[PDB]
């Protein structure tokens, strides 16, 4: 499922995500954007044989088995195929174990490198929240 803005925004909202460990929606919105282009099915591989799975590619080396990915840990306990749901419960479930790890959303390249520190209320804006 390819997600709207504000509908992802309302399912991240539901799903406990508005400031969880003091993240803003804006700031999961928008990562969301650069991960995945809110599309819950996309998959990317990395150079280390690990894949990246949905709307925040989350890693199959340390969150999610795959079965493919030698010497990895399942921290999430889910199949990865899991994390490509039109459901994000799944994905949201794993993002706050991620978040929580000590680096915080800095976990997220593409948050840190095209969220953080930006004006992220932008992804919310103009939704009914
Ligand atoms: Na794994
Ligand atoms: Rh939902
Ligand atoms: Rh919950
Ligand atoms: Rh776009
Ligand atoms: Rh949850
Ligand atoms: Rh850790
Ligand atoms: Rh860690
Ligand atoms: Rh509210």
């Not at 993240?23 to 969301?32: K, R, T």
């Not at 010497?71 to 899991?82: F, M, Q, V, Y």
């Amino acid at each position: 499922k390819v997600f709207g803005r504000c509908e992802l925004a309302a399912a991240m909202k539901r799903h406990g995500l508005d400031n969880y460990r003091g993240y803003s929606l804006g700031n999961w919105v928008c990562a969301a954007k650069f991960e995945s282009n809110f599309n819950t099915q996309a998959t990317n591989r990395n150079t280390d044989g690990s894949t990246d799975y949905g709307i925040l590619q989350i890693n199959s080396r340390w969150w999610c088995n795959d079965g493919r990915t030698p010497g990895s840990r399942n921290l999430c306990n889910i199949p990865c195929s899991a994390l490509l749901s039109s459901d994000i419960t799944a994905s949201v479930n794993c993002a706050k174990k991620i978040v929580s790890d000590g680096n915080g959303m800095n976990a997220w390249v593409a948050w840190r490198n095209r969220c953080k520190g930006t004006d992220v209320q932008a992804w919310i804006r103009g939704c009914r929240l």
